[PDB]
Design an enzyme around this catalytic site. Structure first.
Site, PDB file in Angstrom:
ATOM      1  CE1 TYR A   1       1.010   1.943   4.257  1.00 24.26           C
ATOM      2  CE2 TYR A   1       1.465  -0.656   4.344  1.00 24.26           C
ATOM      3  CZ  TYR A   1       1.404   0.755   4.648  1.00 24.26           C
ATOM      4  OH  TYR A   1       2.249   0.867   5.863  1.00 24.26           O
TER       5      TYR A   1
ATOM      6  CB  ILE B   1      -8.071   2.385  10.672  1.00 29.47           C
ATOM      7  CG1 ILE B   1      -7.489   2.052   9.216  1.00 29.47           C
ATOM      8  CG2 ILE B   1      -7.200   3.192  11.333  1.00 29.47           C
ATOM      9  CD1 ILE B   1      -7.129   3.487   8.234  1.00 29.47           C
TER      10      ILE B   1
ATOM     11  CG  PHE C   1       0.636   9.321   5.333  1.00 30.77           C
ATOM     12  CD1 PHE C   1       0.359   7.943   6.164  1.00 30.77           C
ATOM     13  CD2 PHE C   1      -0.536   9.655   4.714  1.00 30.77           C
ATOM     14  CE1 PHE C   1      -0.558   7.147   5.908  1.00 30.77           C
ATOM     15  CE2 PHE C   1      -1.850   9.014   4.708  1.00 30.77           C
ATOM     16  CZ  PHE C   1      -1.679   7.514   5.245  1.00 30.77           C
ATOM     17  CG  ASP C   2       3.562   3.880   5.854  1.00 30.22           C
ATOM     18  OD1 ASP C   2       4.858   3.703   5.111  1.00 30.22           O
ATOM     19  OD2 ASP C   2       3.175   3.266   6.844  1.00 30.22           O
TER      20      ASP C   2
ATOM     21  CE1 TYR D   1      -5.180   5.526  12.588  1.00 33.58           C
ATOM     22  CE2 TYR D   1      -4.444   6.675  10.687  1.00 33.58           C
ATOM     23  CZ  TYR D   1      -4.191   5.532  11.390  1.00 33.58           C
ATOM     24  OH  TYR D   1      -3.711   4.349  10.947  1.00 33.58           O
TER      25      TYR D   1
ATOM     26  CG  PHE E   1      -4.428   3.748   2.629  1.00 36.42           C
ATOM     27  CD1 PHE E   1      -5.191   4.548   3.556  1.00 36.42           C
ATOM     28  CD2 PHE E   1      -3.192   3.416   3.290  1.00 36.42           C
ATOM     29  CE1 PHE E   1      -5.029   4.732   4.791  1.00 36.42           C
ATOM     30  CE2 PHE E   1      -2.861   3.721   4.568  1.00 36.42           C
ATOM     31  CZ  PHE E   1      -3.858   4.651   5.268  1.00 36.42           C
TER      32      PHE E   1
HETATM   33  C1  LIG Z   1      -4.953  -0.531  19.070  1.00 31.88           C
HETATM   34  O1  LIG Z   1      -5.736  -0.092  17.968  1.00 31.88           O
HETATM   35  C2  LIG Z   1      -5.599  -0.498  16.740  1.00 31.88           C
HETATM   36  C3  LIG Z   1      -4.470   0.481  16.195  1.00 31.88           C
HETATM   37  C4  LIG Z   1      -4.007   0.658  14.916  1.00 31.88           C
HETATM   38  C5  LIG Z   1      -3.063   1.703  14.427  1.00 31.88           C
HETATM   39  C6  LIG Z   1      -2.804   1.877  13.210  1.00 31.88           C
HETATM   40  C7  LIG Z   1      -1.320   2.873  13.209  1.00 31.88           C
HETATM   41  C8  LIG Z   1      -2.560   0.628  12.478  1.00 31.88           C
HETATM   42  C9  LIG Z   1      -1.159  -0.036  12.800  1.00 31.88           C
HETATM   43  C10 LIG Z   1      -0.726  -1.334  12.356  1.00 31.88           C
HETATM   44  O2  LIG Z   1      -1.046  -1.565  11.282  1.00 31.88           O
HETATM   45  C11 LIG Z   1       0.149  -2.375  13.087  1.00 31.88           C
HETATM   46  C12 LIG Z   1       0.252  -3.489  12.298  1.00 31.88           C
HETATM   47  C13 LIG Z   1      -1.019  -2.864  14.268  1.00 31.88           C
HETATM   48  C14 LIG Z   1      -0.911  -2.327  15.602  1.00 31.88           C
HETATM   49  C15 LIG Z   1       0.002  -1.101  16.018  1.00 31.88           C
HETATM   50  C16 LIG Z   1      -1.884  -2.933  16.658  1.00 31.88           C
HETATM   51  O3  LIG Z   1      -2.935  -3.606  16.081  1.00 31.88           O
HETATM   52  C17 LIG Z   1      -1.421  -3.608  17.523  1.00 31.88           C
HETATM   53  O4  LIG Z   1      -2.473  -4.123  18.556  1.00 31.88           O
HETATM   54  C18 LIG Z   1      -2.664  -5.114  19.365  1.00 31.88           C
HETATM   55  C19 LIG Z   1      -1.018  -5.015  16.983  1.00 31.88           C
HETATM   56  O5  LIG Z   1      -1.970  -6.177  17.244  1.00 31.88           O
HETATM   57  C20 LIG Z   1       0.433  -5.278  16.581  1.00 31.88           C
HETATM   58  C21 LIG Z   1       0.343  -6.506  15.719  1.00 31.88           C
HETATM   59  C22 LIG Z   1       1.595  -5.251  17.669  1.00 31.88           C
HETATM   60  C23 LIG Z   1       2.842  -5.220  17.341  1.00 31.88           C
HETATM   61  C24 LIG Z   1       3.716  -5.380  18.629  1.00 31.88           C
HETATM   62  C25 LIG Z   1       2.983  -3.919  16.761  1.00 31.88           C
HETATM   63  C26 LIG Z   1       3.313  -3.467  15.400  1.00 31.88           C
HETATM   64  C27 LIG Z   1       3.595  -2.219  14.990  1.00 31.88           C
HETATM   65  C28 LIG Z   1       3.622  -1.898  13.490  1.00 31.88           C
HETATM   66  C29 LIG Z   1       3.679  -0.522  13.144  1.00 31.88           C
HETATM   67  C30 LIG Z   1       3.838  -0.039  11.771  1.00 31.88           C
HETATM   68  C31 LIG Z   1       3.568  -1.158  10.723  1.00 31.88           C
HETATM   69  C32 LIG Z   1       3.821   1.277  11.247  1.00 31.88           C
HETATM   70  C33 LIG Z   1       5.257   1.446  10.526  1.00 31.88           C
HETATM   71  C34 LIG Z   1       4.953   1.551   8.978  1.00 31.88           C
HETATM   72  C35 LIG Z   1       6.230   2.023   8.430  1.00 31.88           C
HETATM   73  C36 LIG Z   1       7.121   2.236   9.641  1.00 31.88           C
HETATM   74  C37 LIG Z   1       8.450   2.714   9.231  1.00 31.88           C
HETATM   75  S1  LIG Z   1       6.300   2.178  11.035  1.00 31.88           S
HETATM   76  C38 LIG Z   1       2.502   1.487  10.652  1.00 31.88           C
HETATM   77  C39 LIG Z   1       2.295   3.178  10.407  1.00 31.88           C
HETATM   78  C40 LIG Z   1       1.645   3.858  11.521  1.00 31.88           C
HETATM   79  C41 LIG Z   1       1.056   4.919  11.412  1.00 31.88           C
HETATM   80  C42 LIG Z   1       0.212   5.458  10.067  1.00 31.88           C
HETATM   81  C43 LIG Z   1       0.364   6.636   9.806  1.00 31.88           C
HETATM   82  C44 LIG Z   1       0.785   4.317   8.870  1.00 31.88           C
HETATM   83  O6  LIG Z   1       1.948   4.967   8.383  1.00 31.88           O
HETATM   84  O7  LIG Z   1       1.257   3.060   9.412  1.00 31.88           O
HETATM   85  C45 LIG Z   1      -0.433   4.082   7.929  1.00 31.88           C
HETATM   86  O8  LIG Z   1      -0.295   4.139   6.682  1.00 31.88           O
HETATM   87  C46 LIG Z   1      -1.445   3.341   8.490  1.00 31.88           C
HETATM   88  O9  LIG Z   1      -2.618   4.184   8.727  1.00 31.88           O
HETATM   89  N1  LIG Z   1      -1.727   1.838   8.543  1.00 31.88           N
HETATM   90  C47 LIG Z   1      -0.789   1.097   8.709  1.00 31.88           C
HETATM   91  C48 LIG Z   1      -0.862   0.416   7.236  1.00 31.88           C
HETATM   92  C49 LIG Z   1      -2.395  -0.353   7.311  1.00 31.88           C
HETATM   93  C50 LIG Z   1      -3.500   0.753   7.626  1.00 31.88           C
HETATM   94  C51 LIG Z   1      -2.993   1.799   8.898  1.00 31.88           C
HETATM   95  C52 LIG Z   1      -3.253   0.929  10.045  1.00 31.88           C
HETATM   96  O10 LIG Z   1      -4.453   0.575  10.339  1.00 31.88           O
HETATM   97  O11 LIG Z   1      -2.442   1.016  11.178  1.00 31.88           O
HETATM   98  C53 LIG Z   1      -5.381   1.164  14.104  1.00 31.88           C
HETATM   99  C54 LIG Z   1      -6.557   0.236  14.724  1.00 31.88           C
HETATM  100  C55 LIG Z   1      -6.845  -0.129  15.998  1.00 31.88           C
HETATM  101  O12 LIG Z   1      -7.779  -0.832  16.176  1.00 31.88           O
END
Ligand SMILES: CO[C@@H]1C[C@H](C[C@@H](C)[C@@H]2CC(=O)[C@H](C)/C=C(\C)[C@@H](O)[C@@H](OC)C(=O)[C@H](C)C[C@H](C)/C=C/C=C/C=C(\C)[C@@H](c3ccc(C)s3)C[C@@H]3CC[C@@H](C)[C@@](O)(O3)C(=O)C(=O)N3CCCC[C@H]3C(=O)O2)CC[C@H]1O
Lengths: 107, 94
Positions: free
Chosen positions: A26, A56, A36-37, A82, A99
């Protein structure tokens, strides 16, 4: 909440089932085209599971309508993105997000 | 208290990410993450901790560096460089 326009057609029969991992590529942008990503930039596909609320709402509903191989444009209202909060330093409040998502496979 | 480094981290990184992404609480994220990194500092004393360390030792250390970078720059982008690695470790752990 989330509009879905097709850029490239999919096989039209393979829709994601709950508990399945969607592997995708994506590029998220703000209403005005500002990037932004993007996974394509990192050259690393993005994997996640539907119905687990990991991503989301716009994506949850949006990607669920995509079939394998399809590439679409998702226009998500702030309600499905958001909200008023946005994401500090990245996504502003009340932001409509766009997206470009390609559903590559299901595993 | 006896718990494997694998479980201690899978569980921790999930809690951390929820407080930051879910609640926008950068504070609770560091409170949770901090003690985890400190323990690693102490070094492994078992075969499983050691192998867990050989596998994800570096990644974690780098992620902790990216957080420090953030503490000094206030750039939300440095914080995300860390989460790219925490995600990576988390994925492999499952
Ligand atoms: C807790 O509530 C949930 C939070 C979630 C937050 C947004 C930001 C999500 C983040 C994710 O896709 C990741 C995979 C999942 C989470 C952080 C959580 O669901 C968490 O909760 C239990 C979880 O299960 C994961 C697996 C835990 C694990 C330890 C942490 C993973 C962190 C991963 C971070 C990632 C991939 C970031 C990086 C990408 C590039 C980098 C460099 S860092 C993603 C970033 C964060 C900021 C935003 C503007 C963005 O650019 O994506 C983005 O484009 C975005 O909006 N995304 C990510 C792409 C898919 C759509 C959307 C989204 O839903 O993201 C949204 C839905 C809510 O239900």
């Amino acid at each position: 909440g989330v509009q879905v326009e097709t850029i490239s057609p999919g096989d039209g029969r393979t829709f994601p089932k709950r508990g399945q991992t969607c592997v995708v590529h994506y590029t998220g942008m703000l209403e005005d085209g500002k990037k932004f990503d993007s996974s394509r930039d990192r050259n690393k596909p993005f994997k996640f599971m539907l119905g687990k609320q990991e991503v989301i709402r716009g994506w949850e509903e949006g990607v669920a309508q995509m079939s394998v191989g399809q590439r679409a444009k998702l226009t998500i209202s702030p309600d499905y993105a958001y909200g008023a909060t946005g994401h500090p330093g990245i996504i502003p409040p009340h932001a409509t997000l766009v997206f470009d998502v390609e559903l590559l496979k299901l595993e | 208290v006896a718990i494997l480094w694998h479980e201690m981290w899978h569980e921790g990184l999930e809690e951390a990410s929820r407080l930051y992404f879910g609640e926008r609480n950068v504070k609770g994220m560091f409170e949770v993450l901090e003690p985890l990194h400190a323990m690693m500092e102490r070094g492994p004393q078992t075969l499983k901790e050691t192998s867990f360390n050989q596998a994800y030792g570096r990644d974690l250390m780098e992620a902790q560096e990216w957080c420090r970078k953030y503490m000094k720059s206030g750039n939300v982008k440095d914080l995300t460089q860390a989460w790219d690695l925490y995600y990576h470790v988390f994925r492999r752990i499952s």
